[PDB]
Amino acid sequence: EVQLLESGGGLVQPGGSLRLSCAASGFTFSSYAMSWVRQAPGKGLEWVSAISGSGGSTYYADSVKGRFTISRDNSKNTLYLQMNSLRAEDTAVYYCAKDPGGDSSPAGRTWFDPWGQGTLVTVSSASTKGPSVFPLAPSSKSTSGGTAALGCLVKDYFPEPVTVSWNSGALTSGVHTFPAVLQSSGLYSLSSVVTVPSSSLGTQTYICNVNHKPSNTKVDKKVEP
Amino acid sequence: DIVMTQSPDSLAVSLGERATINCKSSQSVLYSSNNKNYLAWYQQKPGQPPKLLIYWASTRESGVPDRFSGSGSGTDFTLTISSLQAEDVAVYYCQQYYSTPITFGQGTRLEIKRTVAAPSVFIFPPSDEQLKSGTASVVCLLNNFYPREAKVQWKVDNALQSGNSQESVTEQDSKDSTYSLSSTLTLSKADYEKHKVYACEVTHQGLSSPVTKSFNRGE
């Protein structure tokens, strides 16, 4: 199958630079025009740049002209986006996307299939910080009839994202990990909760597994009644 | 540049019914030489990339369920989803590829309408661990409710609070079509220890009167 896999996203100072990569597999890479398309958080889709199969033609949106450079290595099945002079408004998930039919002209004048999963680029002067994790312990005020709620508060981190699992992935039914809120401090916070049988509280162990890869922070918090 | 405008921006439709989304281009995307409309449709679920549904205005991509169909010509296009399924909650985008730069519509958020479901409400005091660092986060959970509109009112010794809480709402669940919501009240430890009764009052269409969950600090 045709697959695209982006990498290289992360936190960048305003005015700074970053290089994104997209590894392609499952097709003759040089026969297809390739594009970058980005999506600011909560916003729509904006085409950024495209390159012909051979790499002989490159095109850019006006919003990035003079700052971004698209390239490809047709010996390594890889597409690149060099981003210089980055601005706050460049914050977005960046997607790699393939011309489904071939090498349409001009490069990028096409619909797209497939798209990669995206890589998150955050442009901010705020510093990286790992979260504190605190239990949301189940109790009578979180127990109604046969169901209890419990969870973990993941407080004061930057940048996005954090991942939360329960019991190292074994517990998924009833889990809600909420979208982060940006606090007035400039740090994010979120909670992850799960609902479980109240009859299970006395004997079943519950642990939330928090991961903040931007800061290499890994925390396991056992949540007890 | 060609401007793509979708109508409506959002709508709610129940399972098994038909949803229709319109897309208008600011100039025609019909090429007379091959009689093709240079128009595509995508579906984007939360946390996922867009997924191709339709191209050439009406050609369904291989593997896309036949309940998705595109129609229209020139400047006026339509995506119709018959027999809506719970997992169809998504943002749908049209896109022209008639001329560069290619441009997308602004997206239409499709909500799944379901029966009214009252939230289950839970309140969590701050942990002792957090308190010894000087801040108290009090958390109120509203679990698995529909519709999305809900009001959380924090009360501290029966004084209604404002300006010191933040809310977050989940994406609509792809199986049961409900929402959940967290509200966090943030106080300094000194302010937290000055008061006794911490209460979360919830107003929702599924509740015949507002529901309050509370605790007394230090019990």
């Binding site: 011309d99 039919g101 071939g102 090498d103 349409s104 002209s105 001009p106 004048r109 096409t110 | 090429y31 030489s33 091959n34 093709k36 240079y38 590829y97 008639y98 001329s99």
Partner: peptide, 8 residues
């Protein structure tokens, strides 16, 4: 073979 001709 690519039917995505440039409409110019």
């Amino acid at each position: 073979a690519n039917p995505n001709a440039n409409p110019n």
